[PDB]
Design a protein around this nucleic acid. Structure first.
Length: 135
RNA sequence: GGAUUGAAACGCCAUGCUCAGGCUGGCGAGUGCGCGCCACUCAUCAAG
């Protein structure tokens, strides 16, 4: 799932008037499964550093095909991972929102930074921060 | 015999724990303490 779950999280948070943000060839999107949608050539970047993934570059990303060895079936750049532009923006925005330390849904474990959330509003979201790292 | 988001893909090159430093200086097992008090080898049996 993963990318689809971030998309669903954006859908959930974007509905609320607060604690979120509403901002907005053809193919089939692998995130939503919708057919005939404008595929994205290049996904918006994901924050690195203090407000993002610790140890990564400021403009890190999840989907990238910057070298030829990573390209298959004659596809160029992110066309190798066909996802509609709106879905790409939504999942990137959700991941960035979770990566913001101001929101209490982030924890760093050695090399990796862990972000967690629930399918619906629940007190577990603010509780689990202590489970993985008790005070 | 066209296609297993496949086909190809080193964590890899190299790096003294070393230089050294008494467990030593010295301290009676010692002062003393009967194996000793008694007790028949003895009552017999030619030499051939």
């Amino acid at each position: 799932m993963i990318l689809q779950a971030l998309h669903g999280y954006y859908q959930r948070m974007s509905a609320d008037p607060d604690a979120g943000m509403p901002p907005y060839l053809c193919g089939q999107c692998l995130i939503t499964g919708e057919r005939q949608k404008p595929i994205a050539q290049l996904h918006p970047s994901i924050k690195g550093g203090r407000d993002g993934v610790r140890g990564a570059q400021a403009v890190a990303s999840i989907v990238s095909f910057n070298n030829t060895a990573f390209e298959s079936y004659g596809k160029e750049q992110s066309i190798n991972a066909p996802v509609s532009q709106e879905a790409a923006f939504s999942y990137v925005t959700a991941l960035n929102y979770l990566l913001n330390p101001s929101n209490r849904q982030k924890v760093t474990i050695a090399d990796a930074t862990v972000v967690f959330w629930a399918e619906r509003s629940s007190p577990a979201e603010d509780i689990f921060a202590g489970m993985f790292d008790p005070p």
